[PDB]
Amino acid sequence: AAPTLTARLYSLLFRRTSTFALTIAVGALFFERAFDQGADAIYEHINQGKLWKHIKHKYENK
Amino acid sequence: LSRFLGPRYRELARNWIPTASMWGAVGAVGLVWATDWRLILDWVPYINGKF
Amino acid sequence: KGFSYLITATTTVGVAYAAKNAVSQFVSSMSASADVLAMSKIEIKLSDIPEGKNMAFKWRGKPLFVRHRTKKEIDQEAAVEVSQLRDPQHDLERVKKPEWVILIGVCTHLGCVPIANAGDFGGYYCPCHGSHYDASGRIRKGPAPLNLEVPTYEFTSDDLVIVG
Amino acid sequence: TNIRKSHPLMKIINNAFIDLPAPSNISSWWNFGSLLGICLILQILTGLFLAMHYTSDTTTAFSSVTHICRDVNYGWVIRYLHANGASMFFICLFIHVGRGLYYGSYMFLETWNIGVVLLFTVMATAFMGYVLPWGQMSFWGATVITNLLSAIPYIGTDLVEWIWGGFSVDKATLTRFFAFHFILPFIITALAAVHLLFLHETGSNNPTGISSDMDKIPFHPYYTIKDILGALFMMLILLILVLFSPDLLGDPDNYTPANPLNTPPHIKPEWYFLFAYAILRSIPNKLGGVLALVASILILILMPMLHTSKQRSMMFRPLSQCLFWMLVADLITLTWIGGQPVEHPFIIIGQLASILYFLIILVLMPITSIIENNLLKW
Amino acid sequence: TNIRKSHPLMKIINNAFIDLPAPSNISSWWNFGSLLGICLILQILTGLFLAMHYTSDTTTAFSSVTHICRDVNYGWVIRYLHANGASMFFICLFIHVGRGLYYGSYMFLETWNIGVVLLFTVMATAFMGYVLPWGQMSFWGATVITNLLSAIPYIGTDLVEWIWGGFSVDKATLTRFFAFHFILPFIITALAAVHLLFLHETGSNNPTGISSDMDKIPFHPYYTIKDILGALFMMLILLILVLFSPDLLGDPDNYTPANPLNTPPHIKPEWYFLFAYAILRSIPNKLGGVLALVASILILILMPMLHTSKQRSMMFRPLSQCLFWMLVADLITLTWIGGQPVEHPFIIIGQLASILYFLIILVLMPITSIIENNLLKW
Amino acid sequence: TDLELHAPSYPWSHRGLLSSLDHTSIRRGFQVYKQVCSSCHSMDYVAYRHLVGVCYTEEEAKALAEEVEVQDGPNEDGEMFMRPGKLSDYFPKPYPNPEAARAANNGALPPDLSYIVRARHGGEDYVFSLLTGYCEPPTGVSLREGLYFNPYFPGQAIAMAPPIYNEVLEFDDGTPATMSQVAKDVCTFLRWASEPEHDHRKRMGLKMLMMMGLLLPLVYAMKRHKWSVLKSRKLAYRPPK
Amino acid sequence: EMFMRPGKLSDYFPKPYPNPEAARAANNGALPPDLSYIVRARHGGEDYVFSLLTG
Amino acid sequence: GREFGHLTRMRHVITYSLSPFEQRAFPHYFTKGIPNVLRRTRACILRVAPPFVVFYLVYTWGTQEFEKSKRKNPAAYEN
Numbered sequence A: 001a002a003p004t005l006t007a008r009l010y011s012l013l014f015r016r017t018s019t020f021a022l023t024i025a026v027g028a029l030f031f032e033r034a035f036d037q038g039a040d041a042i043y044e045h046i047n048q049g050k051l052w053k054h055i056k057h058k059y060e061n062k
Numbered sequence B: 001l002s003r004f005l006g007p008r009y010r011e012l013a014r015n016w017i018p019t020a021s022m023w024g025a026v027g028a029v030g031l032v033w034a035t036d037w038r039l040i041l042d043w044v045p046y047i048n049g050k051f
Numbered sequence C: 001k002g003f004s005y006l007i008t009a010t011t012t013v014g015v016a017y018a019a020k021n022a023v024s025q026f027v028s029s030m031s032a033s034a035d036v037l038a039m040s041k042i043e044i045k046l047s048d049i050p051e052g053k054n055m056a057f058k059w060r061g062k063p064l065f066v067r068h069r070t071k072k073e074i075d076q077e078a079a080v081e082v083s084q085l086r087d088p089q090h091d092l093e094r095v096k097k098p099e100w101v102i103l104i105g106v107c108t109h110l111g112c113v114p115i116a117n118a119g120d121f122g123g124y125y126c127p128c129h130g131s132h133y134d135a136s137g138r139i140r141k142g143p144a145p146l147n148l149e150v151p152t153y154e155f156t157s158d159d160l161v162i163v164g
Numbered sequence D, E: 001t002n003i004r005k006s007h008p009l010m011k012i013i014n015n016a017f018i019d020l021p022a023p024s025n026i027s028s029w030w031n032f033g034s035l036l037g038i039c040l041i042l043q044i045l046t047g048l049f050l051a052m053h054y055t056s057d058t059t060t061a062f063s064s065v066t067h068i069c070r071d072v073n074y075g076w077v078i079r080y081l082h083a084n085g086a087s088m089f090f091i092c093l094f095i096h097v098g099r100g101l102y103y104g105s106y107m108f109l110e111t112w113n114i115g116v117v118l119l120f121t122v123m124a125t126a127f128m129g130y131v132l133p134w135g136q137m138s139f140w141g142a143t144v145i146t147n148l149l150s151a152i153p154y155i156g157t158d159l160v161e162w163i164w165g166g167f168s169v170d171k172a173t174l175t176r177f178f179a180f181h182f183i184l185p186f187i188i189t190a191l192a193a194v195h196l197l198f199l200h201e202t203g204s205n206n207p208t209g210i211s212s213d214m215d216k217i218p219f220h221p222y223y224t225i226k227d228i229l230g231a232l233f234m235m236l237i238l239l240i241l242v243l244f245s246p247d248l249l250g251d252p253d254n255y256t257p258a259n260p261l262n263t264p265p266h267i268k269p270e271w272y273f274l275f276a277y278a279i280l281r282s283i284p285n286k287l288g289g290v291l292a293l294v295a296s297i298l299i300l301i302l303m304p305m306l307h308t309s310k311q312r313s314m315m316f317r318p319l320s321q322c323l324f325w326m327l328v329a330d331l332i333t334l335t336w337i338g339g340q341p342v343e344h345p346f347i348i349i350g351q352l353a354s355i356l357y358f359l360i361i362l363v364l365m366p367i368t369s370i371i372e373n374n375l376l377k378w
Numbered sequence F: 001t002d003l004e005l006h007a008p009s010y011p012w013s014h015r016g017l018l019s020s021l022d023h024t025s026i027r028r029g030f031q032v033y034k035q036v037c038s039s040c041h042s043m044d045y046v047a048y049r050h051l052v053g054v055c056y057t058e059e060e061a062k063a064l065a066e067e068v069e070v071q072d073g074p075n076e077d078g079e080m081f082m083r084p085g086k087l088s089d090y091f092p093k094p095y096p097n098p099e100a101a102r103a104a105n106n107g108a109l110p111p112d113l114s115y116i117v118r119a120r121h122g123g124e125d126y127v128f129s130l131l132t133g134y135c136e137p138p139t140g141v142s143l144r145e146g147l148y149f150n151p152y153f154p155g156q157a158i159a160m161a162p163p164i165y166n167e168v169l170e171f172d173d174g175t176p177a178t179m180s181q182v183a184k185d186v187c188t189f190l191r192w193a194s195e196p197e198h199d200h201r202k203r204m205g206l207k208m209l210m211m212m213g214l215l216l217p218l219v220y221a222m223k224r225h226k227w228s229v230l231k232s233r234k235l236a237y238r239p240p241k
Numbered sequence G: 001e002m003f004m005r006p007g008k009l010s011d012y013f014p015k016p017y018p019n020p021e022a023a024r025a026a027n028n029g030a031l032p033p034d035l036s037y038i039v040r041a042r043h044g045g046e047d048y049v050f051s052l053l054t055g
Numbered sequence H: 001g002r003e004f005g006h007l008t009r010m011r012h013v014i015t016y017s018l019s020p021f022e023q024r025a026f027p028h029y030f031t032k033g034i035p036n037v038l039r040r041t042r043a044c045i046l047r048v049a050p051p052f053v054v055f056y057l058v059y060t061w062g063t064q065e066f067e068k069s070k071r072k073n074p075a076a077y078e079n
């Protein structure tokens, strides 16, 4: 059958090791921010109200 | 030391430049990713770990 | 090959991110500690001393010559001509409140600290090289051409001075 | 021309970690020794970052430990990693001894003995580092355990006086232990390198026990990724036991500052020693308790001579393997008996547990090995 | 069935000292390296007991060093041996480097490079052990040399801050230099053993500069005795150097406890730094004296490359010899300047010293060897 | 030879393996420390640092720190005087010496707050237990006149007089002060003091589990990937004869 | 906590002042040096320290 | 040395492999292993369980028994 988007994607970045390392780098850069902030907003979301960052309001900006 | 000089060597370096130059770019951007370098992070629309 | 290389690449990314994490942890440890962190940029004692006296509040461990200089000493700054200085520096730019000033005890060479309340200029006297200083502690005689460092500082609360 | 075979150092690494021939049929148990090799360096750097604050003074140390747990930037992680991580070290180490005994990798005599000396060394480093944190268990524990050598009719009571550097535990004795504690691990490294150096030139053991020289297989393509996976999963064990169980691993009481004055209720020695300490309860005369204490580790040396069953291992022999599990169970016994505060039933159970702990290998194992030999013309 | 040869445990040593061939012609100079090894072992055993009693924060510091100096049994003995053991270790060292530069034993490749690495590692070792006493010398010396790392426009000031463990010169920072000094030499002995490992199959060298491939001698009967005799001489000169005049070569003339305001008239270390330190004095602005600070030492790697003689041993190239001994004069001149506080006449002697160094190594000698390549018509 | 009473485990909000301590009960328990908890005992290991991020802005942390002032040291002469109260300052010195507390307390020094959770078996739940354990003696058991019998104390009779009582301390929050809820604020605050990094640590710990979960299957997939060649292989034996 | 005893032989020689700033008062801003090592604390030697007081 | 180039005699034994890329990582990875796991299990549970169960039993044996020598004392010490 016709090559999968993954298939041509091999012929792209994977087969060449430099570009391979490159996509590893950009991939790290995205996985960092996205997963990091995901763990942020989720951890903020689960045991809600235990957080003082939402309880800053008793004492902030008068 | 003069041996480095040569007709193939010119063509050879010409050939090897893409692979090693790519590494430098990969090494540079990755090193920015590792030290979490500042001023370029200013220039990224997405990965602003700063508020 | 795109499939299994996709596997190896993804593993490499998650591991690289994890590595930046733990290495960041290990570098973060040596970098500081919370007690020295509290030591940092905190010394809220404005007007601890009567005017004209030179006080030496500690900061970054190093003593720091804070002073409520008399206005007559700003006049002492005004009297000596600006180009007479190797490093022409009128005092007012060098301090927020002109009656106030701060100085590192370090000199550019050995780093030796000149004595307070001893100076032919009405300020400092520097035994290590014979440099003489006015109320500003302003550089005059050499070898050092530049002023003793005067790190930026803010009087956050009005009497709660905070160098840093 | 050849690059790995170019440089002689590279020649050495290629004779080893790059491509030493290895048996293929290896399971995780052999991954564990490599896991020890994993833990070691981690404790070393961790203890390095800890060594950037801790003091060996009788007075100022504990305050610096509090400097670690509260002041240092993520250093608390480091603190617990060095502690709990050492705990993990002993974890893997015990499995490892169990393996070498089980698959009969003790047949490599000199390698085995270097393993033994390495074991005593690790025990000492353990004890002294445990003395270091400087707390109630630290003090009274170190005192009590040190007292044991005084069982000697002449020399040992003198000798304790020599360790302490004074009448009692003090900045003398504490700095003493800090220094011994520091010098030993680096010794452990060299003993490790020497240990592997004995291993390479006899060939590795295989799960079968029977030689797999015909089936030797390249190291780099295969076992490297295997052991990487194994280290990553131990990293799971450790990080889950530290980020989710920060304290439980040890003995709270050290959390109290030490007082030569104030005296702790129970002074249970830290858990890896518990079986050893249990043996201190075993018999009347402190002297013989010390003798049996050292003998508990020393006894391992007898085994290669005590071994006589035709297996180089213990997996095709569930018979003797049963005696084995009786012995392991016996270790569990000495463990939990050592954990409890002293009591009479615990005393008798500890007695028979100790007698049987020696006799399974001084009586049962060799002779049953003989009858097992009689059954099939061995 | 030789117990030596056949048995692996010791075979490396048979590969090593027991039966390595060595040139029939060897002066005391080749014995000096082994002398340096013994001196290193002594530095370990001495520094170790020092640590057995030494301990410090900001508070414990000089009081504890004095604890050694009086309160510890034989404590003055040890600390005096150690302090004079340093510069003596360098007496083996810069002489070994000098002879190394002379006979062209750096025709051997990696032995040279790693030898230089050992040189830097020992440099930072002595500097980072030097702050242990926490004399005013230790304070301001560490302060200045730490300030030298600010030469980097960006990261370097922070790296200063980062080694500091914070902003100031503190107890944390001394703790850093403590543990670092307290571990780093083990890395040194490791790399040294590696350095011999480069040396092994390459063979040794002769004063003549012609390979004695036909005339090598077994090591044990002879060079060992020569080693031991050397050990007696080094130990003699050391014990004379210290038991009679401990503060002769030893110059810690700041037993004054370190203070933030206190500042001794001369912010200078011992001579082994000073001839290099003088390089800073020569060129204005610290930066160029930093590039010089490293590269003047780092340029030794360039020496094998710029070598142009067709013959080992410089004994057969008199002009390059004269330039070499003149280099000896330039460096001793840098030491004598290093004892001299910054002054104008010594400023001129400063830049003259620097340029003299540059021209003596980088250019002159190879041109000379070219000239005798003409005279010998090579 | 007599047993200590064995405190039953209780289901505190943070004992959930995902669960974190809230800054709330820690704050109110801190109000429990601000007054009644100066009987001392101690907290000297912990300064007004740490208090900043949990509940208190910098100027408010300092504002919290001027409430009481430990001695400034001697300067150029001018020995011993009182600095107004930066957060950098520690909590008040319990006594010029502990021995004074021993004179104040029949020779039995009141322990520092900082490790009492970490050190005691049964921990924080035990500290909440002994506070509320003041049962009367049964007939025939002896007691010292200063002692106030309580089974949770190992010697059965703690010297301490029950600092807690109904309506101990009205909170600035204005929230009601039953001995139960205020004691829960106590030990919650203690557990805070006991483990300052805890709430922060759980976030790091949770994050690591996800990382480990992703890593554990992938790397395993690569092991299968490199060992598949060996697992797959077929072998045969064909004698020449 | 504070009281007075003869102080056994083991004790150090007494502090001239309870605190160093008192020595920075008695001489005003200049506390006297420790003497035990002060000879060995100075460039020169015993002849130097004696010279320092010689005239 | 003892490296591959010279070792044990071995003859007309032959290998059939596959390129890793040509084959998927998990060939019936579930269904094949479970009966294997369970058979290994039934194989060695017989030789593993009894020390541990005997240990657990002695554990509660001494704990509960001594506990009965412990909590129950005031009646045991009589009036």
Ligand SMILES: CCCCCCCCCCCCCCCCC[C@@H](O)O[C@H](CO[C@H](O)CCCCCCCCCCCCCCC)COP(=O)(O)OCC[N+](C)(C)C
Binding pocket: E038, E039, E041, E042, E045, E228, E231, E232, E235
């Ligand atoms: C850390 C810094 C140190 C600085 C200084 C270093 C100094 C190094 C000194 C050590 C180097 C070796 C010394 C040189 C000794 C010369 C050799 C002498 O010992 O003779 C040897 C003899 O050595 C012994 O025979 C070795 C085996 C016997 C050892 C028994 C030990 C007896 C005393 C030990 C006392 C220990 C008591 C412990 C109680 C618990 C044989 O060597 P050789 O030069 O060819 O002599 C030829 C003559 N023959 C024919 C007699 C052989």
Ligand code: HEC
Binding pocket: F036, F037, F038, F039, F040, F041, F042, F105, F108, F109, F110, F111, F113, F116, F127, F130, F153, F157, F158, F159, F160, F161, F162, F163
């Ligand atoms: C009666 C004076 C007093 C009161 C009021 C007081 N403390 Fe105590 N507290 C003590 C003393 C003294 C002890 C231990 C007495 C003993 O062990 O015999 C003690 C014991 C304790 C214990 C358990 C110690 C142990 O060994 O079990 C806790 C928990 C405790 N107090 C909490 C507090 C806290 C926190 C405060 C606020 C400082 C407080 N109580 C008020 C002095 C007091």
Ligand code: HEM
Binding pocket: D030, D031, D032, D033, D034, D035, D036, D037, D040, D096, D097, D100, D105, D106, D108, D111, D112, D113, D114, D115, D116, D118, D119, D192, D195, D196, D199, D204, D205, D206
């Ligand atoms: C942490 C220090 C140690 C290291 C680095 C070390 C080397 C470890 C490792 C790496 C193995 C090789 C098998 C493998 O992991 O793949 C094993 C080699 C060996 N060690 Fe040690 N060891 C150490 C402590 C011990 C102890 C205390 C003993 C008990 C006597 C011991 C007995 C063995 C045996 C028998 C081998 C040979 C490997 C085999 O035949 O399977 N080791 N151990």
Ligand code: HEM
Binding pocket: D040, D043, D044, D045, D046, D047, D048, D049, D050, D051, D054, D065, D079, D082, D083, D086, D087, D089, D122, D125, D126, D127, D129, D130, D132, D133, D134, D182, D185, D186
């Ligand atoms: C495997 C061998 C080692 C063992 C068994 C050991 C003992 C470990 C363990 C058990 C801790 C104790 C932490 C605690 O009890 O709270 C730590 C004690 C200590 N070790 Fe080591 N150590 C070992 C190797 C090292 C190395 C190489 C260093 C330095 C580079 C080091 C520095 C420390 C410090 C500072 C402590 C005391 C920490 C504390 O007070 O909690 N250790 N290490």
Ligand code: HEM
Binding pocket: E029, E030, E031, E033, E034, E036, E037, E040, E096, E097, E100, E105, E106, E108, E111, E112, E114, E115, E116, E117, E118, E119, E192, E193, E195, E196, E199, E203, E204, E205, E300
């Ligand atoms: C512990 C430190 C060192 C050791 C053990 C070591 C080995 C020493 C000794 C023992 C020799 C062997 C030659 C002989 O025995 O005559 C020499 C090998 C050598 N080292 Fe190092 N070295 C050390 C530090 C250095 C340094 C800092 C340099 C200069 C950068 C250096 C340059 C050489 C050279 C050229 C050789 C070979 C000499 C020959 O041809 O015989 N070494 N030194």
Ligand code: HEM
Binding pocket: E040, E043, E044, E046, E047, E048, E049, E050, E051, E054, E065, E068, E078, E079, E080, E082, E083, E084, E085, E086, E087, E089, E125, E126, E127, E128, E129, E130, E131, E132, E133, E181, E182, E183, E185
């Ligand atoms: C060859 C390497 C070493 C040198 C040159 C050396 C001398 C260094 C430096 C330079 C000093 C201060 C100045 C001096 O007295 O010389 C310090 C002396 C000292 N060293 Fe070493 N050391 C070395 C290896 C060690 C090691 C490995 C330890 C710990 C095991 C150690 C513990 C000390 C202590 C406590 C002092 C100060 C006490 C005294 O001798 O007065 N040193 N270190």
Ligand code: FES
Binding pocket: C107, C108, C109, C110, C126, C128, C129, C130, C131, C141, C142, C143, C144
């Ligand atoms: S010393 Fe720098 S100006 Fe006098």
